[PDB]
Amino acid sequence: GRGANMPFTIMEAESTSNATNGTKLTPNFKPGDYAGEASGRSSVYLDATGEYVEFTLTSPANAFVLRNAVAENTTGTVSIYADGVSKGKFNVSSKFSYLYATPSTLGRLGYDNAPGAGLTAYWLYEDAQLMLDQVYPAGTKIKIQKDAGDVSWIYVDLLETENVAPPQANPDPTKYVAVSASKSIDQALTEFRQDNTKKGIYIPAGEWTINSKIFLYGRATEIVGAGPWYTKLVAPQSQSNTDVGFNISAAANGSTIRDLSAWGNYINRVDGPGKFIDGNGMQNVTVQNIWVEHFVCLYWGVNSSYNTFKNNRIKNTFAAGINMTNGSSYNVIDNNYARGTGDDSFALFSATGSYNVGNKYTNLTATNVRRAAAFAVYGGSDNLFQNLYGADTLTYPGITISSYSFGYNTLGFGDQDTVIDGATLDRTGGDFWTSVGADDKINEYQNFGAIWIYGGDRAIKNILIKNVDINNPVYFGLMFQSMSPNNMVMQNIRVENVNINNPSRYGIKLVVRAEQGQGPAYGGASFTNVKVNNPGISAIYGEAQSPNFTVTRVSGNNW
Ligand SMILES: OC[C@H]1O[C@H](O[C@@H]2[C@@H](O)[C@@H](O)O[C@H](CO)[C@H]2O)[C@H](O)[C@@H](O)[C@@H]1O
Ligand SMILES: OC[C@H]1O[C@H](O[C@@H]2[C@@H](O)[C@@H](O)O[C@H](CO)[C@H]2O)[C@H](O)[C@@H](O)[C@@H]1O
Ligand SMILES: OC[C@H]1O[C@H](O[C@@H]2[C@@H](O)[C@@H](O)O[C@H](CO)[C@H]2O)[C@H](O)[C@@H](O)[C@@H]1O
Numbered sequence: 001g002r003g004a005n006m007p008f009t010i011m012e013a014e015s016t017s018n019a020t021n022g023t024k025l026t027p028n029f030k031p032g033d034y035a036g037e038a039s040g041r042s043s044v045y046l047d048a049t050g051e052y053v054e055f056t057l058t059s060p061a062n063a064f065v066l067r068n069a070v071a072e073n074t075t076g077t078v079s080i081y082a083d084g085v086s087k088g089k090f091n092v093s094s095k096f097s098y099l100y101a102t103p104s105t106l107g108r109l110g111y112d113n114a115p116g117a118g119l120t121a122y123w124l125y126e127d128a129q130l131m132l133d134q135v136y137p138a139g140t141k142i143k144i145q146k147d148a149g150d151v152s153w154i155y156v157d158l159l160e161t162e163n164v165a166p167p168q169a170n171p172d173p174t175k176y177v178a179v180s181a182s183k184s185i186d187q188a189l190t191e192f193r194q195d196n197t198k199k200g201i202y203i204p205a206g207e208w209t210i211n212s213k214i215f216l217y218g219r220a221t222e223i224v225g226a227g228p229w230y231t232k233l234v235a236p237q238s239q240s241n242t243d244v245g246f247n248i249s250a251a252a253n254g255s256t257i258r259d260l261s262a263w264g265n266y267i268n269r270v271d272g273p274g275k276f277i278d279g280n281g282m283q284n285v286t287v288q289n290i291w292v293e294h295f296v297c298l299y300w301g302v303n304s305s306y307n308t309f310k311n312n313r314i315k316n317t318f319a320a321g322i323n324m325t326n327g328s329s330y331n332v333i334d335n336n337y338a339r340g341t342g343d344d345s346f347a348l349f350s351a352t353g354s355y356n357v358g359n360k361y362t363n364l365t366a367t368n369v370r371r372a373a374a375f376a377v378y379g380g381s382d383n384l385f386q387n388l389y390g391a392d393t394l395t396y397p398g399i400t401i402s403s404y405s406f407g408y409n410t411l412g413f414g415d416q417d418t419v420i421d422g423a424t425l426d427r428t429g430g431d432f433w434t435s436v437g438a439d440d441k442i443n444e445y446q447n448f449g450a451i452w453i454y455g456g457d458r459a460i461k462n463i464l465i466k467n468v469d470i471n472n473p474v475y476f477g478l479m480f481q482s483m484s485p486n487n488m489v490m491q492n493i494r495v496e497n498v499n500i501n502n503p504s505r506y507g508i509k510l511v512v513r514a515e516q517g518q519g520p521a522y523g524g525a526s527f528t529n530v531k532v533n534n535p536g537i538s539a540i541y542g543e544a545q546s547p548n549f550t551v552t553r554v555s556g557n558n559w
């Protein structure tokens with residue numbers, strides 16, 4: 001792609017190909033700002049009746065997602081036109097946006113939904129979904145326009161366009177018990193469990209209340225919808241932060257959940273509840289072509305192995321998208337798209353079973369990461385992250401590679417490579433933590449590169465980063481750092497075929513003193529065919545001040 005191959009096309013409102021009579025924001029990297037939080041770090045602000053932005057389809061489309069920002073505590077409309085003819089109205093809302101903190105309390109980002117004295121609003125963008133009754137061809141002018149009766153103002157960030165097939169019917173009424181207006185999901189599952197000839201349940205097109213955790217047990221179960229634009233599982237929207245969805249017991253290992261969407265009612269992060277799917281220790285489960293929003297996470301695996309998450313869309317969550325922890329091995333996380341997660345979009349946390357091993361995180365896109373990293377790997381052995389696209393992180397790297405234990409029981413990285421192979425990272429990095437007494441100080445925070453290689457309190461070894469393009473990172477391309485006083489010696493850290501384009505500070509930073517009490521990096525790293533192009537200050541910082549770290553320039557480096 002790079003990244004996930006999805007049926008929707010993403011088009012930025014601010015593209016020079018798009019006529020507008022509105023106000024195009026100049027880009028910045030500021031959280032809590034309508035430019036800094038936008039995809040591409042820009043949006044088009046429509047602020048008077050008749051203001052519009054005109055997109056042009058590059059593929060046929062009958063369905064649209066508008067990422068936008070409106071005023072706090074408001075709902076309303078904005079209009080959509082095809083070739084100059086009005087065709088409908090998006091339902092735009094800030095119900096799920098606006099999370100409050102202060103510049104020195106970014107640790108609270110996502111947790112606090114109420115405004116207050118001295119508090120700044122963050123997480124300003126949200127989405128509106130709309131299907132039209134015609135497939136419009138590529139080349140159609142799709143205009144988003146603020147007409148009389150629409151919202152007072154709106155920032156238009158991007159438009160998804162998609163040609164959605166008609167809804168898929170029950171695959172076989174004699175094998176899949178249908179949910180219906182008078183038969184709930186739980187009732188259909190009971191009928192399935194008690195009849196050995198059933199393969200599972202079918203959930204038709206429509207909106208279906210999920211007001212509980214729905215338990216899958218008895219045997220492997222198939223849950224099949226009509227397609228994610230059609231089958232909508234809806235948490236009670238007059239409630240907030242209800243822990244609803246599915247919970248897969250061991251007896252239902254081997255289950256499949258596919259072809260549906262789930263619309264949660266979380267308005268802030270809560271730690272504990274809030275994963276759409278629970279499945280501690282689950283095995284052989286497939287989650288495919290589902291679209292989930294407004295949960296804390298899609299899935300947080302705990303010693304969960306041999307599972308497949310494929311073709312999913314994870315948008316606007318309050319913490320991590322998918323995390324696999326504590327022994328989770330041999331999972332296939334393939335061809336998933338995440339936008340707007342509230343912590344690491346796709347993560348692997350290895351802890352004691354010795355390591356999380358054999359996982360394949362492939363063809364993944366993670367953008368508009370509202371806190372933490374697009375991709376994060378904490379220890380492990382023999383895990384692959386391949387064909388990745390990450391962009392527009394608010395506070396942290398595109399890719400975190402860390403051997404910090406966080407106080408848990410872990411051995412760090414193991415004896416087989418953790419591989420990052422094929423990645424494009426656009427406008428990644430950010431500010432987090434504090435930098436009191438730091439070297440190379442530019443603000444009150446620690447400052448994160450597109451890729452952060454952090455030796456923590458556990459072994460940091462066998463890391464291969466290859467075939468990566470890093471475009472316009474906030475600060476740095478590659479950032480290497482060792483936690484003091486542990487000073488774990490980094491071994492077998494290799495970087496190959498990497499382009500670092502226009503970093504504002506340095507192509508590569510060896511962190512010398514992150515904050516008071518911290519020192520430089522230990523071990524070394526090899527660089528082959530690593531190009532640093534147009535750095536703001538210099539290609540590499542910290543080499544002379546890092547006497548315990550050896551930079552090896554194998555060949556092909558312009559620095
Ligand atoms: O009040 C519930 C939600 O209403 C809106 O979203 C609509 C949704 O409920 C479903 O019916 O689909 C339509 C069309 O895509 C949505 O517009 C609000 O936008 C959402 O904030 C509310 O929770
Ligand atoms: O293994 C660590 C814990 O993981 C889960 O809780 C997470 C919490 O520590 C924090 O990271 O936030 C996320 C998102 O809300 C939580 O999932 C488990 O729930 C917890 O039992 C573990 O100790
Ligand atoms: O020391 C306890 C904290 O460790 C981690 O955060 C570190 C932070 O405190 C600061 O020192 O910077 C380093 C990175 O340079 C951070 O890793 C944990 O993330 C945090 O939860 C702990 O409280």
Ligand SMILES: [Ca+2]
Pocket residue numbers: 012013014038039040041042043156157158
């Ligand atoms: Ca944009």
